[PDB]
Amino acid sequence: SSLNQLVSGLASGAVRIVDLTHTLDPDFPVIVLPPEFGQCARFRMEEISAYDHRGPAWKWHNISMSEHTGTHFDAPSHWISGKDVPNGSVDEIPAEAFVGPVVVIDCSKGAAENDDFELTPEIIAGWESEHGRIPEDAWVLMRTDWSKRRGADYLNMRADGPHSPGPTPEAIRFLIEERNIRGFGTETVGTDAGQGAHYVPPYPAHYLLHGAGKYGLQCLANLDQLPATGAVLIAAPLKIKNGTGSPLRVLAMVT
Amino acid sequence: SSLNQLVSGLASGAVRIVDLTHTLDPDFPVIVLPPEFGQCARFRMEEISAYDHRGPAWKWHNISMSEHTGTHFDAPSHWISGKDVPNGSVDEIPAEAFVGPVVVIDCSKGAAENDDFELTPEIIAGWESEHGRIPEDAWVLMRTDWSKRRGADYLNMRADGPHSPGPTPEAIRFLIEERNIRGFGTETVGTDAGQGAHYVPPYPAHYLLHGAGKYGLQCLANLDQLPATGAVLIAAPLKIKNGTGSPLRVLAMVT
Ligand SMILES: Nc1ccccc1C(=O)C(=O)O
Ligand SMILES: Nc1ccccc1C(=O)C(=O)O
Ligand SMILES: [Mn+2]
Ligand SMILES: [Mn+2]
């Protein structure tokens, strides 16, 4: 069966697993919004005990964060457009959605030349002419190697806001309506471009994806280790009651 | 090759995904220790905004918990015996450890008759005469249907402590030394019996497993939906810096 052969492949090294997740720690940046809005929290952790009088033979921590901290998954209820879609929270999404085919569109050269680099319908058509049509219900990842930027360069906040690559409304509408993708993922802090508030509609990845009951992934790492096609993405969010998303361990299995 | 067949199976339903995770919520019980010690925290969440003046077009929460809250994963560094094993924290465990073969030993009839039901080497031997030798580097799950218990029955706290099924020290030692398992999982709050403090060594699942650089899973649900052999477990914990474990979405793929 396919499961027995996956086990054999993982055992022999014919199938490798790539970790697409940033480490959770207090220093990792989270999305920054205008100061009048409630803000996403950074990851924090505190010891309960560390093999001491509070717990002599064990070590463990309390942790705090937001649903949208670090490498994380966005459910449709995250956006106003996904308010009434079925199974809109992370605890309600059907489990078969958490494992599936993934395609990677390499936009890293574009991002290196332009902070606001745009994934367009034209780029998608060019990619498909080379790698074949995007299969239905696939995860689509926009590779930018943005995960290599550290410090203030990662959010890349300027006076007129953050500047980081992302999809145009037309690119997202195409993926949803013409390809019925499962979800869209980025190496940036958001599924939308840094300047994405200024598209029509505002935050089109969030508005259109979540309005269609589709999912988002953000702050992905190591996309440069993945093939354009043929890998399998594992992205199972925490089963948070009525959760709009959660941090998660994103993995890719590759041949 | 094998991944293409997995994709095909997942798409067609020839491969099904079983969700083994309890919902993360304030009311799900966590392990309780003697009062002089630091205690595991319950899951908590608060709204940042809900499509309102705090965040007009979006909804999201801040969340807090322990590494060992709910359906969760225990890394070797959790126990004093595994403090110094290489790759001992959840952020260091090789990603290939997160996907692999799983066997399910059905102890539900026993658990229904005895709150303190013990998984023994003899029971494991009986399981193997029926289902074949436990494969090396496999996840072993102790099924008890304990997850069907709600209210105070789940912790099953009495005047002399909690009473819930678990493995004997000899069982764990056998699985480690004679079968070289990857890890051990249960539907109860701990990988150890409720009365596991009174074994030698105290809490032997933790002491022995984590001492051997092996992993734990706790509070699993729906084990009664899995085959004894043939399934693949997906158990990828959060990439917490120096983390001793984390809540996670545990899944099984079944043919
Ligand atoms: N929470 C948000 C609010 C406004 C704009 C964007 C976002 C995100 O990118 C997010 O989902 O983390
Ligand atoms: N953290 C503990 C401390 C003492 C005994 C048991 C435990 C656990 O079961 C656990 O790892 O969740
Ligand atoms: Mn998000
Ligand atoms: Mn634990």
Residue numbers in the entry:
A (entry chain B), B (entry chain A): 2 to 256
Publication excerpt:
The structures of LaIHA:benzyl benzoate and LaIHA:isatinate were determined at 1.50 Å and 1.79 Å resolution, respectively, while the one of RsIHA was determined at 2.65 Å resolution. In particular, the final binding state of isatinate shows bidentate coordination to the manganese ion, and similar stacking interactions with the indole rings of Trp59, Trp61, Trp80 and Tyr204. Asp75 forms a bidentate contact in LaIHA:Benzyl benzoate and a mono-dentate electrostatic contact in the LaIHA:isatinate structures. The mono or bi-dentate coordination results in two or one water molecules as additional ligands, respectively, preserving the octahedral geometry. Additional stabilization of the moiety into the product is obtained by the deprotonation of the nucleophile OH− group by His79 to produce a carboxylate group chelating the Mn2+ as observed in the crystal structure. The strong exothermic isomerisation step (−10 kcal mol−1) yields a structure of isatinate with a strong intra-molecular H-bond between the amino and the α-carbonyl groups. This possible intermediate most likely constitutes the driving force of the reaction and traps the isatinate as a ligand to Mn2+ in its product state before it is replaced by water and released from the binding pocket.
Here we present two crystal structures of LaIHA, one bound to the hydrolytic product isatinate, and one bound to benzyl benzoate, as well as the apo structure of homologous RsIHA. Together with results from enzyme kinetic analysis, the resolved structures are used to describe the molecular basis for the Mn2+-dependent mechanism of hydrolysis, showing that IHA is a true orthologue of IHB. The highly conserved Mn2+ binding site is located at the bottom of the substrate-binding pocket.
